[PDB]
């Protein structure tokens, strides 16, 4: 039979029913863009939801669950079709089945529901998903299944508004301390993206991640073999160093900076860009943190990327330099000058982007003020690489911020 298997799936004969449900799974899983809307319109939803509760026929449960999984892998209203069929408690009950494949499909389906939004994530949590989900983690587990569990964990960690419940985050984090030591690449990428989501959620959640003791296992992943592990780890620790200076200092005490030269010379250019982002957040800190940036020999590399990189990376280098001019000491800005930052920093003054030209003007302004005893020779080294001319031209700019700053810098330091 071909279409009206809506009928066959409501048969006394469990073979007919199972074949029809397997056919519904066939329609919903063979192709590229499954016809979810016709399936929902056809009224096979309540039938498949009933199938979920059939403890006597696990194959029927599995087929129904994978049909519904693919329905809830679709649009927001498509996921709500499954939810409002009121099947989430049924999947939760299937989590306790003695059949691995039924558990796997229940976990998969719940993961698709949780991944829809903060509302559905909180709903699925509220019916008690996390403790059974986390019990599956065992040294005696199939890996194809462990990956699905870690995926669902990532979905539990997402959607900043409102962030996931504090109870649930501190329930998850011990599981992540176990999973971050695993050898599979997929497991680590998902684990570290879970951490990235949490640390992006806010300073309290950052403090939970710090308090879990997992940061010393996270930082060394920055120089891991695989690039996906590296990018996700860089994202997580960058999010952490977005917080307070003491949180940032936890990251630095895990010797995080020793990993970055490799990141600053990595051929992939987004990695350079994000590594200099990280560094810009570090130079925004206190004097000892600027000194850690300096002592890691990252100052010449940042100036190098400022000089020769593309626009995207030069922007981040410019933030790093300006934030160091804001945050630094006598000898620190002096070391920066000894590393010959002035010419490339000035050449960015002519850029299409207003924010970045303003940033370099701010940095220059603070550098002239910073060393008032070299203020004459600093003005000369600026004028040497054509910086005076570009500043006088930005005095002719259409943005109030830019020309007012250019006029202000020309007034204080250029007696000429």
């Amino acid at each position: 039979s071909l279409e009206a298997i809506v009928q066959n799936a409501s048969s006394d004969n469990q073979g007919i029913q199972l074949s029809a449900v397997q056919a519904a799974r066939k329609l919903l899983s063979s192709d590229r863009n499954p016809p979810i809307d016709d399936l929902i319109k056809s009224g096979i939803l309540p039938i498949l939801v009933h199938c979920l509760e059939r403890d006597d026929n696990p194959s029927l449960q599995f087929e129904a669950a994978w049909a519904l999984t693919n329905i809830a892998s679709g649009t927001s209203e498509q996921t709500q079709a499954v939810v409002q069929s009121n099947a989430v408690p049924l999947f939760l009950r299937l989590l306790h089945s003695p059949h691995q494949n039924v558990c796997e499909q229940a976990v998969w389906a719940l993961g698709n529901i949780i991944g829809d939004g903060p509302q559905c994530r909180d709903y699925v949590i509220s019916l008690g998903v996390v403790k059974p989900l986390l019990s599956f983690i065992s040294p005696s587990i199939p890996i194809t299944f462990l990956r699905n569990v870690t995926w669902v964990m990532v979905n539990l960690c997402r959607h900043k508004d409102p962030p996931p419940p504090m109870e649930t985050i501190q329930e998850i984090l011990p599981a992540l301390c176990v999973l971050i030591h695993h050898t599979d690449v997929n497991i680590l990428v998902d684990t570290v993206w879970a951490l990235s989501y949490l640390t992006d959620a806010g300073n309290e959640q950052i403090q939970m991640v710090i308090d879990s003791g997992i940061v010393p296992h996270l930082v060394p992943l920055l120089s891991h073999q695989e690039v996906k592990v590296q990018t996700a780890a860089l994202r997580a620790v960058g999010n952490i160093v977005t917080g307070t200076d003491e949180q940032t200092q936890v990251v630095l005490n895990c010797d995080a900076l020793s990993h970055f030269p490799a990141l600053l010379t990595h051929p992939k250019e987004k990695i350079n860009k994000e590594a200099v982002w990280f560094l810009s957040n570090i130079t925004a800190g206190n004097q000892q943190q600027v000194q850690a940036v300096i002592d890691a020999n990252l100052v010449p590399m940042i100036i190098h990327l400022l000089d020769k990189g593309d626009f995207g990376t030069q922007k981040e280098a410019a933030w790093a330099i300006s934030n160091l001019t804001i945050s630094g000491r006598k000898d620190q800005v002096a070391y920066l000058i000894q590393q010959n930052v002035i010419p490339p920093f000035c050449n960015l003054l002519t850029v299409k982007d207003a924010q970045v030209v303003q940033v370099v003007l701010d940095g220059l302004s603070n550098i002239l003020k910073m060393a008032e005893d070299e203020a004459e020779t600093i003005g000369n080294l600026i004028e040497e690489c054509g910086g005076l001319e570009k500043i006088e031209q930005l005095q002719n700019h259409e943005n109030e911020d830019i020309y007012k700053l250019a006029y202000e810098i020309i007034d204080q330091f250029f007696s000429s």
Partner: peptide, 11 residues
């Protein structure tokens, strides 16, 4: 970067 919803693909 990991995709939030994921459909199950036939072997």
């Amino acid at each position: 970067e990991v995709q939030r919803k994921r459909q199950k693909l036939m072997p």
